[PDB]
Amino acid sequence: MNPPPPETSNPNKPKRQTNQLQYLLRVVLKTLWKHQFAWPFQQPVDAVKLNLPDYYKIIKTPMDMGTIKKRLENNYYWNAQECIQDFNTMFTNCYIYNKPGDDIVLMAEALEKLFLQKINELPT
Ligand SMILES: O=[N+]([O-])c1cc(Cl)c(O)c2ncccc12
């Protein structure tokens, strides 16, 4: 079945809140969340429901915007770069599992371009 979801808290990890990390939540994630193509990325891939029994055979560092949102809400990250790496893992996993031009990939590519637009300029 499905693996445990990625952690959204960790008391051994030091927490921080920066202007940039608040912006990644309130502006970047909250607007990506509203996109019509966001729904596949709002929660961990349910390989059992989706009948993708090889998914977690191939994807060993899963990530999703639901997990990122909870991390941001928990101040789980030390800096904005940690959060941006999670977004990139999410996108890269989708391009690894799937193939150019697949419906799910076109959705990921639309979100990625939007994501790149929004982090082009972060607050001070
Ligand atoms: O939720 N989904 O339907 C979903 C999400 C993600 Cl992130 C994927 O890579 C998928 N790949 C193939 C089929 C469905 C997928």
Swiss-Prot record:
Ubiquitously expressed. Phosphorylation by CK2 disrupt the intramolecular binding between the bromo domain 2 and the NPS region and promotes binding between the NPS and the BID regions, leading to activate the protein and promote binding to acetylated histones. In absence of phosphorylation, BRD4 does not localize to p53/TP53 target gene promoters, phosphorylation promoting recruitment to p53/TP53 target promoters. Changing residue 103 to G: Found in a patient with a neurodevelopmental syndrome; uncertain significance. Changing residue 98 to A: Abolishes binding to acetylated histones. Belongs to the BET family. Chromatin reader protein that recognizes and binds acetylated histones and plays a key role in transmission of epigenetic memory across cell divisions and transcription regulation. Remains associated with acetylated chromatin throughout the entire cell cycle and provides epigenetic memory for postmitotic G1 gene transcription by preserving acetylated chromatin status and maintaining high-order chromatin structure. During interphase, plays a key role in regulating the transcription of signal-inducible genes by associating with the P-TEFb complex and recruiting it to promoters. JQ1, a thieno-triazolo-1,4-diazepine derivative, and I-BET, a benzodiazepine derivative, have been tested on tumors with success. Treatment with GSK1210151A (I-BET151, a I-BET derivative) has strong effets on mixed lineage leukemia and promotes myeloid differentiation and leukemia stem-cell depletion. It is linked to Cornelia de Lange syndrome 6: A form of Cornelia de Lange syndrome, a clinically heterogeneous developmental disorder associated with malformations affecting multiple systems. It is characterized by facial dysmorphisms, abnormal hands and feet, growth delay, cognitive retardation, hirsutism, gastroesophageal dysfunction and cardiac, ophthalmologic and genitourinary anomalies. CDLS6 inheritance is autosomal dominant. Interacts with p53/TP53; the interaction is direct. Interacts (via CTD region) with CDK9 and CCNT1, acting as an associated component of P-TEFb complex. Interacts with RELA (when acetylated at 'Lys-310'). Interacts (via NET domain) with NSD3, CHD4, BICRA and ATAD5. The interaction with BICRA bridges BRD4 to the GBAF complex. Interacts (via NET domain) with JMJD6 (via JmjC and N-terminal domains); the interaction is stronger in presence of ssRNA and recruits JMJD6 on distal enhancers. Interacts with NSD3. Interacts with NIPBL. (Microbial infection) Interacts with bovine papillomavirus type 1 regulatory protein E2. This interactions may serve for the tethering of viral genomes to host mitotic chromosomes allowing successful partitioning of the viral genome during cell division. The NET domain mediates interaction with a number of chromatin proteins involved in transcription regulation (NSD3, JMJD6, CHD4, GLTSCR1 and ATAD5). The C-terminal (CTD) region mediates interaction and recruitment of CDK9 and CCNT1 subunits of the P-TEFb complex. It is also required for maintenance of higher-order chromatin structure. This is Bromodomain-containing protein 4. It comes from Homo sapiens (Human). The lineage of its organism: Eukaryota, Metazoa, Chordata, Craniata, Vertebrata.
